[model samples]
Target: SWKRAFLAFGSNIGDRFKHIQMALQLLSREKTVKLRNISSIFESEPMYFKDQTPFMNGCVEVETLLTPSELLKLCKKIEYEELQRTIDLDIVMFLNSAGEDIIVNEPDLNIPHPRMLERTFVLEPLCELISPVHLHPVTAEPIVDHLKQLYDKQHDEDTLWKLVPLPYRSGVEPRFLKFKTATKTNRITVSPTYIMAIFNATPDSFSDGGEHFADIESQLNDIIKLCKDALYLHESVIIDVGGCSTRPNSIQASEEEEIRRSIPLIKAIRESTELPQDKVILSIDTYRSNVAKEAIKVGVDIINDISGGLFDSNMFAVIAENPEICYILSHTRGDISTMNRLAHYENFALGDSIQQEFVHNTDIQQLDDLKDKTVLIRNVGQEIGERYIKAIDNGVKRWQILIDPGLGFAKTWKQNLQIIRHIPILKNYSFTMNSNNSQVYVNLRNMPVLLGPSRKKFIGHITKDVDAKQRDFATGAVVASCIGFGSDMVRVHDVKNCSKSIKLADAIYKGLE
Candidate 1:
């Protein structure tokens, strides 16, 4: 016989208690599965939609003769046939005889429910029953600590209250618990995350803008050189090329001007570089749909837009048509010229209030005077729902969309820090499998982030003495801090130096990388 398995139960629909009881009865009918232990019922608020009725949640442990996959299938069949459940009944894990936990991931079934970590209702009761269960697979922290950290973050406020005491059964033995170690096949793999090289092909960018624009040939040469350098030194996965400068007080280029500056370089680089198409991804950074269309025509794999489809009305439609392109939707309030004007926050920058401000300030007003100055700063999660639906509707594959919380684009110095601090929130909207499988990348550039604090008017407002070059050390410290907080990727211009800093920081905080 196989070892004990832990499964979660939740109900929100009619006769919630009876529904659970019936499901338990049906589960009991399996001869191979012996009911071992169960948790007390927990009533908690819904995590996703607050308007829905609260859920009654609990976990059951059973000794099973079936394999992990077979047991998972039975759980699904019971959920559909006996419970008539429209929502999911999650299977947390199946422990084998060797005392190793297995996370099931069949194409049609998702075991070890992906969102369980984000929900308090499921975790609190489950943790209560099994005091020290397996730690979170990704963060490598104990389940109890993960729950406490999430609670502190207040990501979800589903009030959890104990219901009835767990129905006790005699003749049960305490099953030995097992920990699931990280493996390459697991969605969250332990690998060196990809580095993204930032190339600003504009003349007016705040840092190193005019340095590259002596001529188009020289510009192309420099980009190729950087691409080679990134590949050699850091083994960067993507080369992000942007034409328009996103710096505050930067000049807004015409659609034609943007194309002229960027398209030719993209074409030349694609033709010249020997980098493999699949491995070496080329991203066109632009807010305009026209520029995106032109760039994709020449085999660009990704579209990195700062505007999140709000700036260009045609952006969504264009992306919808080109399903092959991976779109990165970043959070920002205004365009380059107008971004700084809107960075003021009345309250701490998190949750629905920030989203509402973005919608009201950007889409509703249509303020051209503030165009580029304060484009509306959408909440970190603003574009998630629409993008998900659109991708599904368009038959686009998974990992086709990436989320970026715009840093130093339109945010005030304080808001930028807040965005970095709350990066874990991005996991809420990120593709679930990728969230589990891949590391989240956070970009921090010495020139842009530091210059905004030092040379830019905002930093000058606070201090009279700091200069642009002097801020690199502070910039390195911030990058080190972001790494400590679980940032996987850091975008930077000074690749060799920042890479060294990341390695050192990783050794100090997270052990040798």
Candidate 2:
């Protein structure tokens, strides 16, 4: 029995050209698979793993006697043992000469490669060997169409346009995280400052609940108007739809209640002519994944999980299945009872040499009592992203993740301030790769940091504005300050008002950029 399969070849180390040529020789040396057709070798700029040298790569169509599993083993053996390649030769897709179901997800391999869609180098050479119209085994899109889409989304800003490093401090230079937006258009995305406009749909959210509208329909339209107005008038890019309230000591609503509130509103935004699909990005603020699943079906763009996938077991699966949307992987200690426990660092493990200085003589109860948001174990910031290490290990790309420092979740007011002051320090801390991770995530180094100091109790603590309604001025100050320290985005309730101040912040951020 014989089969036709395609393998992608890449070599980045010393003598890349020779390494690839030698790879072909070694690949053919095996009788299990014979190289039938080889693509034009291309030199690709490093992506995914940017720290590496340019990868010389191509695709090859092979007529194989062995099964896909056997061929993969042989490929791995040669790449690792014989060729001494950094990673194994990748099998992009394996189509039996006659038709057959060619899908596999296993420990060592995933058929129709899991990462093929995002990678241009693989698709660029792949399209040359396969028919442009040949549909992908997974997405069912033509190779040319997929390749073209990838090309369009990628930046051509050239390395020279990439900013020279800014002057810096606190044992490091500032870091910026890049998100893929439409590069086909001419919008200059200078600052990483993304504006997430809060759309509170619940009956009582303490801050804006019952403040929206008398009627649901008008409320939806008003939200649409505000979002459209923001797009027309300000720098708003996100609309967060929250259904049931998770306000402290609040009744965590039933699943039925949340879906009912959000699904229709999500549907409304997508159907509105004022907000085109791409023009408005949708985020559903719920810990429950079922609500997230429903929201995604109707054009929601991000699962702003306040629980960081801790609440529902299926939250991770929802993310894995729909890689199309972004994820706000936030940090929360747990539910309200658990959160209240986190309000004060009663068992504060020691960190930072200065802890004993500011903390030793201070009254522990006083610190915890004033808690709107409290807990500062110095250098404890990376503790947030590290919480999601298991999920990231299981197919979630770090590039798709945005970090929420969870300003008010469990950490104290003083602790939250330390979180703001040392955002860059945390950036480096998170980027320090552990042995379990791929070196690729290292390039995702200063991942986009999200700050939502939006009228939280902590802001009330800092500004002495106990009323959440009047703390817009204080929230704007924190938002602007965090942007200077490299916080990528701020989730704000007052989009129009906060938007203006952030533009000035971006002016400073851009100058620093």
Candidate 3:
């Protein structure tokens, strides 16, 4: 008979997240054990050893047919002795099939692991799996009470933080990003501003089109090399590969052609041996659900849809089906053919009443040029908020979402300027999700925002640079300003310049120095 059990995982060795993921995968591979719920990964200061680096900690609830002693034996064997690294997996609590705690008092194994109450790393993650009312087997007191007592004694640096890991590829170590979990009143908080390096596989993209080799075979090889170089350059960078050109007035490629252009490049990157598998993060920029499905099958980590599921009815469903892939829901008004003419934002009329509401929400009382632009920012938030709600209803997790306010898709030069100036307001976009019985209010307050103001018509309009390639200097300034305006990620054609621009911007805005 299967029994309920809780396990605590800790790693302070090489590639901590990789070791944890590997251990969990190995545990789940067992014939008689089924891994169930998982707590969000947390990082905490080493409790006993102050000299070493911090440890990554998490908990798992499993249903296993093996008794306590046998389960311990399998866990001990899974530790990676081959790599000279170790993962500590302890059976914290084991319960019989009757849903009651089972006590073990052997020399090798101890049930309700003797010291869990003294460690916040264990109690914090354990509390996430069990309710506050759930009792400790030995003390018969609520575990949440123990967690609260521990919290009261700890300082800010000692607090356990929640983290989300980038999807791991076969050869590459996984990257973990820090974000605060959302609740009804508080929004999510992002710690690092990531850089998204753009690689255009199309011959006619707005900027940098036909930049790679002409032949498909050479194109694949060239892209793979460039992607590895980019990943090597920056730890926070992710390569975004786009085959079809979605720039304004650009004709859409056939579905089969788009797949041909993107899937081969993705496959080449995934199969490349020269590239470090642990460092590669791939995102496919496509609105067609078929293209997204194929890219995901090839192990793409993120899907960036400019149409936000409006172009293809199946897009939201596809995203819902694959919960692991992150989705970028960007805001654009019309389809490829009509978006240019559909830029009229009558909804953002500048009125006296509207000005007051803007000041109240953003707390910027200056009545200068910002008054009207702030209203437009709110309107963009409203439009994207609708799609966000729709995406959530279709089963997209909030944590896996990154929002982009379409820079040049359907807007004029002035509207594009407004978006960059008031990027902070878009993060405050509020919405609600319906749960079992009540309506859960949520906001994009801390949601990661991706700003793609790359070499576009707006920057050209400002610098009067007709050639897109010459606008890198102007794009650099825009990238810096976007970071100052609270944009979490910037998509760019010139990674060299923009990467430098972001470094200084991060120093100033994020106080990196």
Candidate 4:
């Protein structure tokens, strides 16, 4: 049999959650330590050492038979012997076999640590392990008082906060994520399956190319008309305006050229006397950071990056600087040379360039659940996920983020369908799995997902049609399915049809009958 004890662990280096898990497991493996309850994790500034990395701290309860010295010895064993970490760890509190507090200040150890009372990082998480009112051994005051006292403090010596969710796994993946658009104060909150009307003002777009930009003056008005007609057509919301064509081997434009294509029309719309400003959401779609800066300069509401933040190192800062702006952290990497890079999956036989169904990891015949089983999606998702995990840690809010699976940008035809079908599972996570810094990654599990399945090659290939305009039927199917499967929005070419599709899907998929 074992007795009860409590420990506080923290880290400011490497994988914070991984360290905590390892320490817990190492103690659990020992016969003397019976791990019991673990508290929620927290991120706080380094109080005494302010210049270093932020620290993740939390509490754990255990039932142990080893004397205080012996238990302390085992903790040191894991710190140096098991993971051989260079990070910080300590036993901030402990309860003896008698289930009572022991107050001691030996040369090497302190039972009921002397300083735990002043630190919310220690007290709050500790409060979670049992009661909100556990008394300190010496002062006999409630442990949660430390957090209340924090607000009472008159100094800037420390900072603290609760992260995401607690424990080993993700909580319910949220079906919808919010975005602050239009303006910081004037914003839009959308549920999954909102329609994003794609306005490609480029002569060379793979599908809608040459349709909207042959003459910028006349073309811009026609584009605005598509948006206006949607008033009665369907309750359409966002309009994605992009200049560059990301198709395979497409001619990449100069920064000036791309900006000319996107910004002039943005200015034209803002100057327009007739368009209803409040009804439509405006999004800037570009891979370059400078283009994003220009878009924001002209008051574009969203930054839809195809290369995630990897395209422009400055992209993160752009998003951070504009806290009110919604950022689309779509997955796809590589610059102009590799913009349309395609992958070869050995397990998937769908591609002779015309790929097929998403396969589950097992079973003799059925397609894999696209949500979690889609391989390439996860690869791109995790890669981009890490960036946002860091972005939030660095101060970008989760609500300002919108994720796109990069349907036509990075994937082939069959892969595109799987991406559409399994888009829900891509929301399975938006950051690394089992991370210790659960504070930042916690709120993003059901990350806002966007899909751009408009008039892409996949639509034409799947429908067995060659004309981009003819793929409207396929585009409608993909958009509706995307909405049905919990998509936040679909960026498409034909506003009228996709809008109608959204109305039906929203009623069937989102409306509660």
RMSD of each: 17.8, 16.0, 9.4, 15.5
| Model 3 error, position 134 (Å) | 25
Write model 4 residue lDDT over 1-513, tens digit each, in one string.
355677888887776756776776788798777765565456777878879987877877778888888888888878886455444556776666555777768999988877777786786566545443356787787664555566356343444444422112123221112321111211112333556777777877444646556466776677678777677655446777888877766787788989989988877775566776555667788878888888877757788888778767778887766654778887765665665665543342222221112111112124335333556655555556566666664545454677777876656788778777666455543321344522112223335677787778887876788887788888788777777766767787788777788777767766522
User: lDDT ranking from best to worst?
Assistant: 3, 2, 4, 1
The TM-score that candidate 4 achieves is: 0.57
Off by over 4 Å in 3: 1-155, 158-165, 171-175, 179-192, 205-207, 211-214, 224-233, 348-373, 431-440
Q: Indicate the residue-level lDDT of 261 in model 2.
A: 78
Highest-scoring model, lDDT: 3
Error of 2 at 197 (Å): 0.3
Query: Local error of candidate 3 at 175, Å?
Result: 4.4
Write the candidate numbers in order of decreasing TM-score: 3, 2, 4, 1
CA lDDT of each prediction against the hidden true structure: 0.56, 0.64, 0.73, 0.64
Per-residue CA lDDT of candidate 2, range 1-513, in tens?
Answer: 678788998877765545665776788788777765555445566776777776666777788988889989878877876444443488889877574538888897789998888776787567645543368888887765776677566555221111111112134323222332223322123544778888888778444757653356766776776676567645347788888776666776688988887888888876777664444667889889889889888867777888878888788787766543667888777686568667665443322211121111122344564223333432244345444554554544343467786886777777788778866554433222234321111211224668888888878886788688899988888889988777777888887788877877878765523
| Candidate 2, number of clashes | 6
Shift of residue 84 alpha carbon in model 2, Å: 28
**Residue runs of model 4 more than 4 Å from their true location after superposition:** 1-192, 205-214, 233-236, 339-374, 393-395, 430-443
Clashes per candidate, residues 3 or more apart or on different chains: 15, 6, 5, 12
- What's the distance in Å from true for residue 447, model 1? 26
Error of 4 at 178 (Å): 4.6
lDDT (Cα, 0-100) at 36 in candidate 2: 59
Candidate 2 overall Cα lDDT vs. reference? 0.64
